[PDB]
Design an enzyme around this catalytic site. Structure first.
Site, PDB file in Angstrom:
ATOM      1  CB  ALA A   1      -0.651   0.253   1.104  1.00  0.00           C
ATOM      2  CG  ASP A   2      -0.101   4.439  -2.866  1.00  0.00           C
ATOM      3  OD1 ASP A   2      -0.517   4.602  -2.821  1.00  0.00           O
ATOM      4  OD2 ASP A   2       0.490   3.697  -3.974  1.00  0.00           O
ATOM      5  CB  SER A   3       0.870   7.838   0.437  1.00  0.00           C
ATOM      6  OG  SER A   3       1.540   8.587  -0.055  1.00  0.00           O
TER       7      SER A   3
END
Ligand SMILES: [Cl-]
Ligand SMILES: [Zn+2]
Ligand SMILES: [Zn+2]
Ligand SMILES: [Zn+2]
Ligand SMILES: [Zn+2]
Ligand SMILES: [Zn+2]
Ligand SMILES: [Zn+2]
Ligand SMILES: [Zn+2]
Length: 77
Positions: free
Chosen positions: A33-35
């Site tokens: 998961a990215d930001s």
């Protein structure tokens, strides 16, 4: 179940396979998961279960288990 509903939301968002969506799996380190993903996941959990996750609590949500355990104390199942 609540657990399955949560896992499905995660699979929809990250495109990760459910076998990896375990309680101790870290959204960032394990599920990629990215930001933006994390912001969208929190938004999704709130809207789905009709609750709020204040910023302070959101910062402490690091694993799938955190989400499930937290939700189980806020909704009935
Ligand atoms: Cl529920
Ligand atoms: Zn779906
Ligand atoms: Zn499979
Ligand atoms: Zn890991
Ligand atoms: Zn989006
Ligand atoms: Zn919200
Ligand atoms: Zn909120
Ligand atoms: Zn708090």
């Amino acid at each position: 179940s609540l657990e399955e509903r949560v896992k499905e939301i995660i699979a929809e968002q990250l495109g990760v396979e459910k076998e990896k969506i375990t309680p101790e799996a870290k959204f960032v380190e394990d599920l990629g998961a990215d930001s933006l993903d994390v912001v969208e996941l929190i938004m999704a959990f709130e809207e789905e279960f009709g609750i709020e996750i204040p910023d302070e609590d959101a910062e402490k949500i690091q694993t799938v288990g955190d989400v499930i355990n937290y939700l189980k104390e806020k909704v009935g199942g």
